[PDB]
Amino acid sequence: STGSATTTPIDSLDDAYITPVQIGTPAQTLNLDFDTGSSDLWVFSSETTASEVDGQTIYTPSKSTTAKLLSGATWSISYGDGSSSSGDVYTDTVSVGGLTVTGQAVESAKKVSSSFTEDSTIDGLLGLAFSTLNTVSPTQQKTFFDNAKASLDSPVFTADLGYHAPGTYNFGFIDTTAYTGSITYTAVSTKQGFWEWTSTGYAVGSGTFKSTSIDGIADTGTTLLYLPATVVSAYWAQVSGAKSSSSVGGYVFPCSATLPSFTFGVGSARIVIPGDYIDFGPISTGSSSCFGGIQSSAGIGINIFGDVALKAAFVVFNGATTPTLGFASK
Predict the structure, then answer these.
(1) 208: Cβ–Cβ under 8 A, 6 or more apart, which residues?
(2) Which of 38, 120, 160, 209 could form an S-S bond across to 55 if both were Cys, CB 3.0 to 4.6 Å?
(3) Which sequence spans correspond to the domains of the chain?
């Protein structure tokens, strides 16, 4: 089998992407944030504290004839951005772009933190990291991809995120029309449960490439590119007027400035992030100070190749027995 679904930016800055997902019978369609940095499929629901729901579409398991309580199961997650959610668990039929999994764990939120409430466009998350990170207790549950894998034509999914435009998540096949050149594959460590890999270096604009190992994660659920402070400083030093602002919480720059591209290495291959992808607009409405899309990972504890990086490439998440990651230009 295969599936193919369009993923759409939630706003004009590509702060996140939402993908429609069918849950239950008859189908209830929720717009989920596909997140290769986590491993829980959780949704706003009829069980979510009323005061914490503000415009989201909810899953109502009592209206699904295929929903079954996963008795005794609970879940609780906290994300790198400080947000969180928790609740109980049903199994139900879940379809993405034509691909159907029966008995998928659907984690129903009883509580969500304010940032989730405040984002009317995201109805939940669909985790695509390794199932070892799944938070369901007492019985850890598998991701949608893990459940689908054996049925897929090939045990892979791909992320083709757009810049200020829709893109595509495919399951079970590689669309050879969606990228230019060749796909370069690179080793993955699953030791932390992430799609963790090592970039071979970077360049700033037309500058010479610096060969240096940068271990990080391919994370569709993170907006920006978070890299070591040395790398980030070298980037912003090439932007007139850019500065790190402790009050804002990262690098800012005047929008009158031209942003250089940023290149990262995948083996001997190179992915070029155009300068415009690094512009996240005014820090507040009407401000001449713009927020940067490349920020320091110092004190996150891990480097994160988030949407800023991934949307410059066609990315293969290869879930073969030994997982790997593939990157192509597009």
Answers:
(1) none
(2) 120
(3) 5-174, 175-330
Q: Is 199 among the catalytic positions?
A: yes
Angle (CA) 197-41-280 rounded to 5° is 60
Encoding tokens for residue 289? 């100070």
The CA distance from 217 to 302, in Å, is 8
- The topology under which CATH files domain 5-174 is Cathepsin D, subunit A; domain 1 (2.40.70)
Peptide bond between residue 323 and the one before it cis (omega within 30 degrees of 0): no
Give the span between the Cα atoms of 324 and 189, in whole angstroms: 8
Q: How would you class 246 by CB atoms within 10 Å of its CB: exposed for 0-12, middle for 13-18, buried for 19 or more?
A: exposed
Name the residue type at position 171. F
14, 35, 92, 119: the catalytic one is 35
CATH of domain 175-330: 2.40.70.10
Cis peptide before 138 (omega within 30 of 0): yes
Q: Which residues contact 244 (CB under 8 A, 6 or more apart)?
A: 236, 250, 251, 252, 296
* The residue to which tokens 């402790």 are assigned: 246
Q: Do domains 5-174 and 175-330 have the same CATH topology?
A: yes
**DSSP 8-state symbol, 147:** H
Q: Which of 45, 85, 199, 296 is catalytic?
A: 199
**Method used to solve the structure:** X-ray
Resolution value (Å, 1 decimal)? 1.5
In angstroms, the CA 52 to CA 50 distance is: 5
Phi-psi region of 63 (alpha: psi -120 to 50; beta: other; left: phi over 0): alpha
Q: Verify whether residue 213 is a known catalytic residue.
A: no
